[PDB]
Design an enzyme around this catalytic site. Structure first.
Site, PDB file in Angstrom:
ATOM      1  N   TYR A  28     -21.017  -6.561   1.115  1.00  0.00           N
ATOM      2  CA  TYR A  28     -19.823  -5.678   1.088  1.00  0.00           C
ATOM      3  C   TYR A  28     -19.134  -5.361   2.410  1.00  0.00           C
ATOM      4  O   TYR A  28     -17.942  -5.089   2.412  1.00  0.00           O
ATOM      5  CB  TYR A  28     -20.088  -4.409   0.270  1.00  0.00           C
ATOM      6  CG  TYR A  28     -19.970  -4.787  -1.165  1.00  0.00           C
ATOM      7  CD1 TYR A  28     -18.710  -4.774  -1.809  1.00  0.00           C
ATOM      8  CD2 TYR A  28     -21.087  -5.241  -1.881  1.00  0.00           C
ATOM      9  CE1 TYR A  28     -18.578  -5.195  -3.164  1.00  0.00           C
ATOM     10  CE2 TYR A  28     -20.965  -5.636  -3.257  1.00  0.00           C
ATOM     11  CZ  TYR A  28     -19.719  -5.633  -3.865  1.00  0.00           C
ATOM     12  OH  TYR A  28     -19.588  -6.047  -5.157  1.00  0.00           O
ATOM     13  N   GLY A  30     -17.232  -6.164   5.425  1.00  0.00           N
ATOM     14  CA  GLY A  30     -16.444  -7.421   5.492  1.00  0.00           C
ATOM     15  C   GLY A  30     -15.313  -7.399   4.485  1.00  0.00           C
ATOM     16  O   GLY A  30     -15.234  -6.475   3.604  1.00  0.00           O
ATOM     17  N   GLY A  32     -13.315  -7.972   1.369  1.00  0.00           N
ATOM     18  CA  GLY A  32     -13.795  -7.932  -0.008  1.00  0.00           C
ATOM     19  C   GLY A  32     -15.310  -7.742  -0.109  1.00  0.00           C
ATOM     20  O   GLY A  32     -15.915  -7.063   0.736  1.00  0.00           O
ATOM     21  N   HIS A  48     -17.350   2.345   0.684  1.00  0.00           N
ATOM     22  CA  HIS A  48     -16.076   2.328   1.484  1.00  0.00           C
ATOM     23  C   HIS A  48     -14.977   1.472   0.802  1.00  0.00           C
ATOM     24  O   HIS A  48     -13.818   1.941   0.593  1.00  0.00           O
ATOM     25  CB  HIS A  48     -16.348   1.890   2.911  1.00  0.00           C
ATOM     26  CG  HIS A  48     -15.136   1.833   3.795  1.00  0.00           C
ATOM     27  ND1 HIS A  48     -14.486   2.964   4.257  1.00  0.00           N
ATOM     28  CD2 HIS A  48     -14.548   0.785   4.429  1.00  0.00           C
ATOM     29  CE1 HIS A  48     -13.543   2.624   5.108  1.00  0.00           C
ATOM     30  NE2 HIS A  48     -13.568   1.309   5.242  1.00  0.00           N
ATOM     31  N   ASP A  49     -15.327   0.228   0.463  1.00  0.00           N
ATOM     32  CA  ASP A  49     -14.418  -0.625  -0.307  1.00  0.00           C
ATOM     33  C   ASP A  49     -13.800   0.112  -1.544  1.00  0.00           C
ATOM     34  O   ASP A  49     -12.542   0.082  -1.769  1.00  0.00           O
ATOM     35  CB  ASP A  49     -15.156  -1.852  -0.815  1.00  0.00           C
ATOM     36  CG  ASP A  49     -15.441  -2.921   0.271  1.00  0.00           C
ATOM     37  OD1 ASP A  49     -15.867  -4.036  -0.128  1.00  0.00           O
ATOM     38  OD2 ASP A  49     -15.271  -2.714   1.482  1.00  0.00           O
ATOM     39  N   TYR A  52     -11.429   2.840  -0.694  1.00  0.00           N
ATOM     40  CA  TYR A  52     -10.093   2.292  -0.434  1.00  0.00           C
ATOM     41  C   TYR A  52      -9.345   1.932  -1.737  1.00  0.00           C
ATOM     42  O   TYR A  52      -8.141   2.120  -1.829  1.00  0.00           O
ATOM     43  CB  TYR A  52     -10.172   1.079   0.544  1.00  0.00           C
ATOM     44  CG  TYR A  52     -10.121   1.505   1.971  1.00  0.00           C
ATOM     45  CD1 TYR A  52      -9.377   0.809   2.886  1.00  0.00           C
ATOM     46  CD2 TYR A  52     -10.759   2.689   2.401  1.00  0.00           C
ATOM     47  CE1 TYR A  52      -9.318   1.211   4.192  1.00  0.00           C
ATOM     48  CE2 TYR A  52     -10.708   3.102   3.734  1.00  0.00           C
ATOM     49  CZ  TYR A  52      -9.985   2.351   4.621  1.00  0.00           C
ATOM     50  OH  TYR A  52      -9.900   2.731   5.936  1.00  0.00           O
ATOM     51  N   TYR A  73      -4.397   8.234  10.934  1.00  0.00           N
ATOM     52  CA  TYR A  73      -4.561   9.639  10.630  1.00  0.00           C
ATOM     53  C   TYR A  73      -4.997  10.225  11.980  1.00  0.00           C
ATOM     54  O   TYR A  73      -5.047   9.509  13.018  1.00  0.00           O
ATOM     55  CB  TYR A  73      -5.599   9.835   9.503  1.00  0.00           C
ATOM     56  CG  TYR A  73      -6.846   8.994   9.778  1.00  0.00           C
ATOM     57  CD1 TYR A  73      -7.727   9.310  10.842  1.00  0.00           C
ATOM     58  CD2 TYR A  73      -7.134   7.863   8.999  1.00  0.00           C
ATOM     59  CE1 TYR A  73      -8.894   8.520  11.094  1.00  0.00           C
ATOM     60  CE2 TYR A  73      -8.264   7.097   9.233  1.00  0.00           C
ATOM     61  CZ  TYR A  73      -9.138   7.409  10.257  1.00  0.00           C
ATOM     62  OH  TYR A  73     -10.254   6.593  10.463  1.00  0.00           O
ATOM     63  N   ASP A  99     -13.404   6.853   5.765  1.00  0.00           N
ATOM     64  CA  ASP A  99     -13.897   6.275   7.020  1.00  0.00           C
ATOM     65  C   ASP A  99     -15.006   7.157   7.578  1.00  0.00           C
ATOM     66  O   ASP A  99     -16.024   6.659   8.058  1.00  0.00           O
ATOM     67  CB  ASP A  99     -12.782   6.066   8.094  1.00  0.00           C
ATOM     68  CG  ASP A  99     -11.736   4.982   7.717  1.00  0.00           C
ATOM     69  OD1 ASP A  99     -11.849   4.314   6.660  1.00  0.00           O
ATOM     70  OD2 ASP A  99     -10.753   4.819   8.500  1.00  0.00           O
TER      71      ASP A  99
HETATM   72  C1  DB7 Z   1      -5.035  -6.032   1.029  1.00  0.00           C
HETATM   73  C2  DB7 Z   1      -5.188  -7.276   1.908  1.00  0.00           C
HETATM   74  C3  DB7 Z   1      -6.513  -7.252   2.708  1.00  0.00           C
HETATM   75  C4  DB7 Z   1      -6.285  -7.335   4.249  1.00  0.00           C
HETATM   76  O1  DB7 Z   1      -7.424  -7.562   5.198  1.00  0.00           O
HETATM   77  C5  DB7 Z   1      -7.781  -6.506   6.035  1.00  0.00           C
HETATM   78  O2  DB7 Z   1      -7.141  -5.456   5.966  1.00  0.00           O
HETATM   79  C6  DB7 Z   1      -8.939  -6.605   7.101  1.00  0.00           C
HETATM   80  C7  DB7 Z   1      -8.548  -7.019   8.377  1.00  0.00           C
HETATM   81  C8  DB7 Z   1      -9.500  -7.116   9.382  1.00  0.00           C
HETATM   82  C9  DB7 Z   1     -10.840  -6.795   9.151  1.00  0.00           C
HETATM   83  C10 DB7 Z   1     -11.253  -6.369   7.903  1.00  0.00           C
HETATM   84  C11 DB7 Z   1     -10.320  -6.258   6.854  1.00  0.00           C
HETATM   85  C12 DB7 Z   1     -10.918  -5.747   5.455  1.00  0.00           C
HETATM   86  O3  DB7 Z   1     -12.148  -5.593   5.348  1.00  0.00           O
HETATM   87  O4  DB7 Z   1     -10.095  -5.429   4.361  1.00  0.00           O
HETATM   88  C13 DB7 Z   1     -10.724  -5.248   3.055  1.00  0.00           C
HETATM   89  C14 DB7 Z   1      -9.772  -5.607   1.901  1.00  0.00           C
HETATM   90  C15 DB7 Z   1     -10.324  -6.739   1.020  1.00  0.00           C
HETATM   91  C16 DB7 Z   1      -9.310  -7.160  -0.052  1.00  0.00           C
HETATM   92 CA    CA Z   2     -15.721  -4.950   1.989  1.00  0.00          CA
HETATM   93 CA    CA Z   3       0.204   8.012   9.400  1.00  0.00          CA
HETATM   94 CA    CA Z   4     -16.470  -3.220   8.202  1.00  0.00          CA
END
Ligand code: DB7
Ligand code: CA
Ligand code: CA
Ligand code: CA
Ligand code: CL
Length: 124
Positions: A28, A30, A32, A48-49, A52, A73, A99
């Site tokens: 997880y 990373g 997705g 966390h995922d 979001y 923020y 976060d």
């Molecule tokens: C909605 C498009 C997703 C965009 O990529 C990122 O923002 C992202 C960029 C750098 C490091 C980690 C992530 C991440 O871990 O994002 C998790 C989102 C997974 C879909």
């Molecule tokens: Ca993730």
């Molecule tokens: Ca803002």
């Molecule tokens: Ca991370």
């Protein structure tokens, strides 16, 4: 915003290089995720995922490029403790809490070196 979360992690775990410690850990931590988290650190990441995923469901909130990582923020770090500013708007406060809860979770979870760069296609 993404940079502030790394900086939160360094707040809660002063030893850490967040990008190298927690990026691509387990299933997880990373971009997705898939399957079931492999330990409690990975589950902090899965939580966390999902935090979001919920924030994106706040009809109240529309993030640049639909990525809550883009939203800045206000917070502060004092002796290892993270504080989310109460003057953050409802969307910012939500992301700030995702976060902070994740940084505090990472801080209390055992760190298993076998799970860094896990073969996710196989194990996740
Ligand atoms: C909605 C498009 C997703 C965009 O990529 C990122 O923002 C992202 C960029 C750098 C490091 C980690 C992530 C991440 O871990 O994002 C998790 C989102 C997974 C879909
Ligand atoms: Ca993730
Ligand atoms: Ca803002
Ligand atoms: Ca991370
Ligand atoms: Cl990270």
């Amino acid at each position: 915003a993404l940079w502030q979360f790394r900086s939160m992690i360094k707040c809660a775990i002063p030893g850490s290089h967040p990008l190298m410690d927690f990026n691509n850990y387990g299933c997880y931590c990373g971009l997705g995720g898939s399957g079931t988290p492999v330990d409690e650190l990975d589950r902090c990441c899965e939580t966390h995922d999902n935090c979001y995923r919920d924030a994106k469901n706040l009809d109240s909130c529309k993030f640049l490029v639909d990525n809550p990582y883009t939203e800045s923020y206000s917070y502060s770090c004092s002796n290892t403790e993270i504080t989310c500013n109460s003057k953050n708007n409802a969307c910012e406060a939500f992301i700030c809490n995702c976060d902070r809860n994740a940084a505090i979770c990472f801080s209390k979870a055992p760190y298993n070196k076998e799970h860094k760069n896990l073969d996710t296609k196989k194990y996740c």
